[PDB]
A paper describes a structure:
Fungi from the large division of Ascomycota possess an evolutionary conserved subfamily of Hsp70s, termed the Ssb-type Hsp70s, which is named after two nearly identical homologues Ssb1 and Ssb2 (collectively Ssb) from Saccharomyces cerevisiae. Ssb is distinguished from other Hsp70 homologues as it interacts directly with the ribosome by a mechanism that is currently unknown. When bound to the ribosome, Ssb interacts with a large variety of nascent polypeptides and assists their cotranslational folding. Ribosome-bound Ssb cooperates with a specific cochaperone termed the ribosome-associated complex (RAC), which is composed of the Hsp70 protein Ssz1 and the Hsp40 protein Zuo1.
We determined the structure of full-length Ssb from the thermophilic Ascomycota Chaetomium thermophilum in the open ATP-bound conformation and characterized its ribosome binding by crosslinking and mutagenesis experiments. After purification and oxidation, only the Ssb T208A-E51C-D534C mutant crystallized in the presence of ATP. The structure was solved at 2.6 Å resolution by molecular replacement using DnaK as a search model11. The resulting electron density map was of high quality showing well defined ATP and Mg2+ ligands, as well as the engineered C51–C534 disulfide bridge. Aspartate 13 coordinates the Mg2+ ion through two water molecules, and Mg2+ in turn coordinates both the ATP β and γ phosphates. As in the ATP-bound open conformation of DnaK, the β-sheet subdomain of the SBD (Ssb-SBDβ, residues 404–513) contacts the NBD subdomains IA, IIA and IB. When we compare Ssb-SBDβ with DnaK-SBDβ two important differences are observed: methionine 410 (threonine 403 in DnaK) seems to restrict the entrance to the substrate binding cleft, and glutamate 411 (methionine 404 in DnaK) may be engaged in polar contacts with the substrate. In Ssb, the SBDβ is followed by SBDα (residues 517–613, helical lid domain) that comprises four α-helices (A–D), with αB to αD forming a three-helix bundle. Ssb SBDα exposes a positively charged surface region conserved in all members of the Ssb subfamily of Hsp70s, but not in canonical cytosolic Hsp70s such as Ssa. Comparison with the closed conformation of DnaK shows that also in the closed conformation of Ssb this region would be solvent exposed and contacts neither SBDβ nor the NBD, indicating that it is available to interact with another partner.
Residue numbers in the entry:
A (entry chain B): 4 to 387, 392 to 437, 442 to 559, 570 to 612
B (entry chain A): 4 to 392, 395 to 560, 572 to 613
The structure:
Amino acid sequence: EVYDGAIGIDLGTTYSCVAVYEGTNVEIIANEQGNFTTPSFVSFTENCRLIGEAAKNQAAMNPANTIFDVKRLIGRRFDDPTVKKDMESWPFKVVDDNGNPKVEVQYLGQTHTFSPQEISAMVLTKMKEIAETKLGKKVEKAVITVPAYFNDNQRQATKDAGAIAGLNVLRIINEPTAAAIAYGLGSGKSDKERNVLIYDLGGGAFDVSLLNIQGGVFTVKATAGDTHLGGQDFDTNLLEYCKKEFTRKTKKDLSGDARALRRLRTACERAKRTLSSGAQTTIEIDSLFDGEDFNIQITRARFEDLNAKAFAGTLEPVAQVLKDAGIEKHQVDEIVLVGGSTRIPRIQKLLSEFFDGKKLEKSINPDEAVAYGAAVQAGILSGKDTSDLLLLDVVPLSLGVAMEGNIFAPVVPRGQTVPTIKKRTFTTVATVQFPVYQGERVNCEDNTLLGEFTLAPIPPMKAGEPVLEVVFEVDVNGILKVTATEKTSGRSANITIANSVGKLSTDEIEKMISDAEKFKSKCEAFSKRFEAKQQLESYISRVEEIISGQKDKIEQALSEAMAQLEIEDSTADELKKKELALKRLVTKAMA
Amino acid sequence: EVYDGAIGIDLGTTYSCVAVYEGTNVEIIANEQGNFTTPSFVSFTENCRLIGEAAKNQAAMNPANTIFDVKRLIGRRFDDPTVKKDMESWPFKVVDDNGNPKVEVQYLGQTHTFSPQEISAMVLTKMKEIAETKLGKKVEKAVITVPAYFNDNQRQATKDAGAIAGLNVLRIINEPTAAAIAYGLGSGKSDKERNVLIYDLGGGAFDVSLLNIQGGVFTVKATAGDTHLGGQDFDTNLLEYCKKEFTRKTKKDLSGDARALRRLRTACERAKRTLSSGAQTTIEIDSLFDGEDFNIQITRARFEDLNAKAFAGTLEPVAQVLKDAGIEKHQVDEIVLVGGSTRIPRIQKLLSEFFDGKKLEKSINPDEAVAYGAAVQAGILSGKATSADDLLLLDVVPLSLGVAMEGNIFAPVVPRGQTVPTIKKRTFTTVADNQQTVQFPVYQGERVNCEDNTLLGEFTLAPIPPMKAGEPVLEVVFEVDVNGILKVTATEKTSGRSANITIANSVGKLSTDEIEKMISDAEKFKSKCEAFSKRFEAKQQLESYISRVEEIISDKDKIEQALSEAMAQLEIEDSTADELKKKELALKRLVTKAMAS
Ligand SMILES: Nc1ncnc2c1ncn2[C@@H]1O[C@H](COP(=O)(O)OP(=O)(O)OP(=O)(O)O)[C@@H](O)[C@H]1O
Ligand SMILES: Nc1ncnc2c1ncn2[C@@H]1O[C@H](COP(=O)(O)OP(=O)(O)OP(=O)(O)O)[C@@H](O)[C@H]1O
Ligand SMILES: [Mg+2]
Ligand SMILES: [Mg+2]
């Protein structure tokens, strides 16, 4: 009853996708709606939580309790510029708690504040349950995907979200590398050394990788990208233009109604997807804001002009990854497209022009390749042809410490293969505390603080004589673990971390897990009791129509059933027992 | 550059699905949006025909010119009851042409009439195009799917639609048989004999089939169903309830607004999909009608109560298939589910209760199994699939084919359940001396009074050799080919001689001339659409160029003059792409010459 294998979960900004691999074939799993991709929406009702198409349908109906874009918010600090801007754009309310942002929603009649790891854990629970419906067994091992440019806080937060979802995260794989698994194994193969450029432009994140494929070894030569650039930004540009036309043609401004913003955003996304096939489209919506209809024509040229800066901007990480691995465009063997936004013809024309008219490779599915590769890797890691598979990934941004004058000291440089061990020596001015950052800027104020690290047990000596060996280890998941040991006096030194972000202690993870199980239990209770009360009331009505000693016993049992119908404390099982007892008694008396 | 194989297309009431099979694996092909199912919508504009989700998304904006549900109209007569009720519910205008229904739209600035075979042909051409970008070659052979209970007029109708789409219809395969191929070959195969029950509840049609599956032999033991029962009927019930509640809460009626009915219908389908998973949902749509908002809550029990008679009715064709096949409930080995509407938990509850709580088989994909099996049979028929996989299909006729006697009383000639292909005979004779004509109506169905059957047509047999009354023996032959289509012939066993047959008051039949002309019109429409794309894109590129050289020139008299000429050419709507490009080149010579100075 327990699935001994492992599933692959592509956790995307806009859509999530689950797949499974059993050694012979990889299958993408469809949800209860028949869709192989499930939107990453989580809405909150009075008694349950909606995830997927159900949550996205109730987005305009309840924008304050419909959560989305958690991927752009997970692992970040509350006062980062991107989350301040996003928070200005998002309709739901985000609060600051001890430096960590948490959304505030109305759930189960009370106010609740959820960390991004909890919401992402809800989405992961949904995908896992899709896999469980497909397999018919309990799923507990999984491989989860992250963008290649995710920093340490984001990867650790995503993995913790995988733990809250009740999954054993066997591996955190980079999405372009998983797509490389889908392309190199599927349409291709052959022990032929080839250079593959992976261009993954999704809904919220952007990645580009350069890999060397020799048989079964996948070697990431380089990678670049932007974890806050996707199709929703293009939707934002077209949305801003449409707002300018609305306030221009009606004098009214719709900026204050999140409902109207949601409907207009949906219309702009539909128009964008239409413009990838045609040369023009039209948006017509009723009321919108303050009872003012809207009708505008959008040309493909207008969309491309509105998104020219971003479309052209995507070429900068391409030249970046090209220079970092030291290869030229003539030497790039293939260019594979991954992500929905790659369906934009302007993007493909920019990439094809950049490589001097080279034709783009589009044999793999841009929506399922990531979950495909993740599923293959999970099936291999759980032992479920392809024994030569080797994954040599890379760290995207430098992991270092803050020097004197707050200058970035890289310990693990970008482009370092993974996993790796690095070491750096510290000493005392007379505990030792230093800030660990990640990024690529010289001044650490322009980098991502991994935290303030304090070394707890130090011997008492003169200044400079103790040598403190600090070890930065980066595992196959790409996550940093630091330790400390000094060569004089031997010994070990435990480390404490303050002012961190995206991490959760084991206690908090256990608490969130138990709370999740309690939520699901309450949902099953509400649904089963609801339907049971409906059925019981219907049968009671039929019995009343039928009746209109024995008479009195019937009427009394019917009054008990009505009482159980009025009491909210009644359980579905008790309701079933009452209905069955009614049927037994009425059949005995009638016969 | 022509694909030698064949594609399998599932032509559904709501969604169509294309697939290909070459010998090893069968691929379900995704469209331009990456979707494996494309909606069966065709909307007409001033310049082009939109097919698919591009047409479905503008259903609220242009409801009078957006066409759908033609699968419930194809092969039917204008005065059929279902055609009248559906016409009362449809926003587009349907017109009777000598009894044949025809969708009338505003297209290319002029009024246009289309037969259902033409619109179905447009959908089939869209799926064919999907397969063509997938394969990189032009395809011209295909196997098209029809419901098992489709009658003779309907089958001939969709086959002619496949001809109009430019395809060579190698076979007309029944949808539960294609799903049966998907389950018997794709889900898993055993050399053990098994009785498989297939329950296909789609968007507009309903089929139940019992097949004997023995390795590679697929034998249809029986089949029943209802070609006019689907999920859209449940959406119609919920919609009618929503109109009752709206009129109750506002004292106003939206039954006259087509856009309002479309928005409410979309919200009802969405609410049904949600109710398949949860126990309750909410419909909230603002400014639905007369500036009146609409907000109600729909419970699952309310939905099931609204569709209780139809849901309970789905079990009757299952009992019918069990009686016809001579099989008890215990002897059914697997119950496979096909069609999106099968996701309704009430339906699965009814089915499982009908078989004493037996678990239903959900191994195959309920949205792609039909295109799966159709693609398999297409690959085998085209010869592209060789050796790998003994596949044999033995199908039956769904309804009895017969004539009408004195008193309009049905006399069956080919009974239901008869294996295909088949040959049956029935004798006629004259009632007077030197009689030259014997005329009889051919019907399909099971009822005794042909008033409740489907008229295949008035068949006139003439002339007859001059003999005395009741002397000639007119052997009439009802032949049913592998597609399930009826061809009738006549002979006079005395002295042989083929006797000529004429058909009148038919439906779903087209002569070769009309089909060829419809193909030509399709070519003209695609040519006009591609032309419009060329003029539009060339126009936009010329605009961008004019703006660029305005920025450049404002940083010469011939460049200004050529600019004015280009703008004036840009103001004319009848400008060709070659003329626009010629003007852009005329500018380009001047500005590039000035750029080199
Ligand atoms: N035909 C199309 N034309 C243009 N854009 C499209 C098209 N189809 C999908 N998109 C865009 O692609 C995005 C979703 O693609 P994808 O599934 O790769 O996102 P994701 O993987 O969830 O995002 P991320 O990789 O950032 O986590 C959507 O934002 C959508 O707007
Ligand atoms: N999750 C769901 N719950 C309930 N109903 C659904 C669900 N998903 C789809 N449906 C219904 O199923 C229908 C689509 O099924 P399908 O694609 O089999 O139709 P079709 O093949 O076009 O119909 P037909 O076979 O009659 O031509 C839709 O009309 C929709 O209303
Ligand atoms: Mg992605
Ligand atoms: Mg169907």
